[PDB]
Amino acid sequence: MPTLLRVYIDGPHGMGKTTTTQLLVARDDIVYVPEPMTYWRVLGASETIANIYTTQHRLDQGEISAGDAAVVMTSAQITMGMPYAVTDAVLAPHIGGEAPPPALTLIFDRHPIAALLCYPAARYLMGSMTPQAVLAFVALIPPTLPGTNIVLGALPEDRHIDRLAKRQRPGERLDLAMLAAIRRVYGLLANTVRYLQCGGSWREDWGQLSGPRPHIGDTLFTLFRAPELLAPNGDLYNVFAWALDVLAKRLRSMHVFILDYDQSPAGCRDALLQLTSGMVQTHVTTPGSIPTICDLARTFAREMGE
Amino acid sequence: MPTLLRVYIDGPHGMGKTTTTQLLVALGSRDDIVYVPEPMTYWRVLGASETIANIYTTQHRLDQGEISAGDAAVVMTSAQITMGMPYAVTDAVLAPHIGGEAPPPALTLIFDRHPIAALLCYPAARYLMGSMTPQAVLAFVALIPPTLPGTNIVLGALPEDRHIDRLAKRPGERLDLAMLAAIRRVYGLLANTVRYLQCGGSWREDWGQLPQSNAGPRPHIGDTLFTLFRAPELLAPNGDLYNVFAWALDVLAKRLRSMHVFILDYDQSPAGCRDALLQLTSGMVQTHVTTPGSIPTICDLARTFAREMGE
Numbered sequence: 001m002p003t004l005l006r007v008y009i010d011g012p013h014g015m016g017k018t019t020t021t022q023l024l025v026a027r028d029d030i031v032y033v034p035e036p037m038t039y040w041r042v043l044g045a046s047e048t049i050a051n052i053y054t055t056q057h058r059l060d061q062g063e064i065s066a067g068d069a070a071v072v073m074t075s076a077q078i079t080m081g082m083p084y085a086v087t088d089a090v091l092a093p094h095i096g097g098e099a100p101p102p103a104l105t106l107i108f109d110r111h112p113i114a115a116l117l118c119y120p121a122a123r124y125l126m127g128s129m130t131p132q133a134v135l136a137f138v139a140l141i142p143p144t145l146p147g148t149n150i151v152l153g154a155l156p157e158d159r160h161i162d163r164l165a166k167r168q169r170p171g172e173r174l175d176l177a178m179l180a181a182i183r184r185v186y187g188l189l190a191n192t193v194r195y196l197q198c199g200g201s202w203r204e205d206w207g208q209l210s211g212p213r214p215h216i217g218d219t220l221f222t223l224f225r226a227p228e229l230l231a232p233n234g235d236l237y238n239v240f241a242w243a244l245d246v247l248a249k250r251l252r253s254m255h256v257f258i259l260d261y262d263q264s265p266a267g268c269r270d271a272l273l274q275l276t277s278g279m280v281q282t283h284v285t286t287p288g289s290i291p292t293i294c295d296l297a298r299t300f301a302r303e304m305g306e
Numbered sequence: 307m308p309t310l311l312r313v314y315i316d317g318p319h320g321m322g323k324t325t326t327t328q329l330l331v332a333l334g335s336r337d338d339i340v341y342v343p344e345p346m347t348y349w350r351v352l353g354a355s356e357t358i359a360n361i362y363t364t365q366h367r368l369d370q371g372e373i374s375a376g377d378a379a380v381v382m383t384s385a386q387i388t389m390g391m392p393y394a395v396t397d398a399v400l401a402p403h404i405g406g407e408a409p410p411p412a413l414t415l416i417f418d419r420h421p422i423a424a425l426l427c428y429p430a431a432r433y434l435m436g437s438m439t440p441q442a443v444l445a446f447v448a449l450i451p452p453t454l455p456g457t458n459i460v461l462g463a464l465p466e467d468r469h470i471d472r473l474a475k476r477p478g479e480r481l482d483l484a485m486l487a488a489i490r491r492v493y494g495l496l497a498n499t500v501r502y503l504q505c506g507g508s509w510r511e512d513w514g515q516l517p518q519s520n521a522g523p524r525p526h527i528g529d530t531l532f533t534l535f536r537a538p539e540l541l542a543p544n545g546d547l548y549n550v551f552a553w554a555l556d557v558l559a560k561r562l563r564s565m566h567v568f569i570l571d572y573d574q575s576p577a578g579c580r581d582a583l584l585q586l587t588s589g590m591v592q593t594h595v596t597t598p599g600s601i602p603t604i605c606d607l608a609r610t611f612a613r614e615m616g617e
């Protein structure tokens with residue numbers, strides 16, 4: 001059966017992700033799946049991004065409670081992740097085991113974990129989502145398929161602020177606190193994958209949060225030493241501990257690649273191209289999978305891309 | 307390999323599901339059948355504060371016109387996410403233990419509700435009540451976990467008059483007969499949807515045409531869950547579904563079609579329901595487990611869950 005390469009370009013917004021990749025299919029055997037802006041602004045709800053930034057701004061000003069903001073943020077994040085969740089689910093049966101040239105390369109703008117883990121966790125750090133909601137999203141992260149190659153960004157903070165200022169989505173507000181939270185989350189994400197792959201056991205190391213791989217205090221696990229999640233004696237409730245077991249399973253089999261964005265758009269493009277030589281390809285499951293996947297991807301772009 | 311029997315008792319609230327589940331479990335030896343309760347403690351305390359009360363209060367304030375549909379939707383959507391969390395995690399932790407479909411089972415697990423109750427049925431019912439968008443319902447559907455082998459779901463049958471009587475007597479709940487009608491309709495649609503799919507129905511082929519299961523002829527698509535999603539919000543200018551929503555229905559078909567549905571008549575005494583459920587288990591699908599230590603592991607998981615979150 002023919003081979004497929006899936007490449008998810010992810011990481012904090014405002015680094016230059018949607019430019020870099022736009023230049024990458026810029027063709028028959030590569031398809032670019034862009035961010036589903038139309039879903040966010042129109043199809044799923046009205047101006048979800050505006051809704052998100054306005055809610056945080058009003059929380060910050062003290063015009064609404066943490067409680068009101070959390071229910072708003074939570075349902076908004078549901079809208080945000082929907083196109084990623086449907087796409088993953090319809091693609092899943094087509095994905096075979098690990099596998100030469102690929103018959104088809106899909107380059108996605110973001111992986112489901114952006115809306116089902118990273119953004120929720122950042123909003124938690126922003127005081128506008130409960131950690132219990134975050135772990136509800138985590139519990140729903142689809143099982144990690146073979147060949148899940150995820151590209152995360154590296155960019156010094158000052159330069160990132162400069163780029164973000166020019167890359168504001170419709171309805172977005174330039175929020176340096178959110179920028180720092182989302183950068184911390186993705187930093188912790190990269191660390192967490194490494195911790196897990198080198199054989200780290202969160203349950204074994206959990207005691208260190210109260211005291212060769214990253215320290216657990218430098219992974220996503222540290223975020224869930226939140227008091228909401230803990231019994232009167234300090235123990236994590238089992239239901240949350242199980243969500244963390246799921247988090248561990250999902251993240252461990254991801255293939256992370258770091259893309260230096262502190263260079264020219266053509267440079268970023270070339271660097272992304274270089275990275276592909278180490279990415280994992282899979283077979284598809286049926287002979288008709290390749291054109292079906294192509295049609296899915298192109299229909300997504302056409303209908304939901306800006 | 308030793309075998310496992312998983313049975314999810316589901317359907318509208320107020321039918322006697324929870325009692326039936328306990329009665330059935332009380333028949334078995336302690337360590338060959340385990341009860342996985344509604345995570346009431348999660349709903350009331352651990353996940354958020356009094357979520358059930360929040361749900362019913364919000365619907366009421368919508369009905370009274372004290373809040374907008376928009377405000378009700380964001381509360382209802384967040385609350386439904388909270389409702390489903392323990393179901394999702396439990397399914398995710400059980401999944402790698404389950405083998406292919408397959409003497410008495412080494413272990414029987416009786417669940418109070420399947421993940422689809424919180425990820426599909428209640429959201430769909432709330433959408434019918436005007437307190438959730440159909441887009442959000444389809445987001446929940448997109449997130450329904452892959453259907454494990456040997457997913458036996460038992461749904462309820464019960465005359466509406468007896469059901470209403472049962473509810474008006476036997477929290478945070480408020481007596482809402484409109485919601486009762488909605489959730490009864492939704493589970494009836496569900497039963498039909500499984501039968502429709504297993505009879506080879508293709509919603510895309512039948513789209514233009516807009517109970518019981520494991521028996522009978524193929525339902526009309528208008529009597530399945532697919533009919534709920536002919537909503538103006540989901541339709542393109544040309545009048546077809548946007549592809550994104552269409553893909554969510556494809557997921558809906560995929561998840562439901564491999565399920566094994568049974569209908570239990572609740573219009574009888576608690577012991578009657580128990581024995582009826584017991585007879586029904588005879589035609590239910592078991593699975594192998596993936597490791598020998600899966601049986602005790604699964605057992606501990608079920609008991610830990612029950613202890614922490616059961617009422």
Ligand SMILES: C#Cc1cn([C@@H]2O[C@H](CO)[C@@H](O)C2(F)F)c(=O)[nH]c1=O
Nearest residue numbers: 013049052080110114115119169172
């Ligand atoms: C995927 C995704 C998400 C994107 N976004 C935002 O949408 C835009 C994506 O470019 C950007 O403003 C953002 F990244 F901040 C969210 O707020 N939440 C998400 O879950």
Ligand SMILES: C#Cc1cn([C@@H]2O[C@H](CO)[C@@H](O)C2(F)F)c(=O)[nH]c1=O
Nearest residue numbers: 319344358361389419423424428479
């Ligand atoms: C599972 C479940 C759910 C239960 N419930 C309610 O919880 C209560 C106990 O089951 C009952 O009032 C109910 F079933 F209606 C919801 O409102 N939503 C759900 O998703």
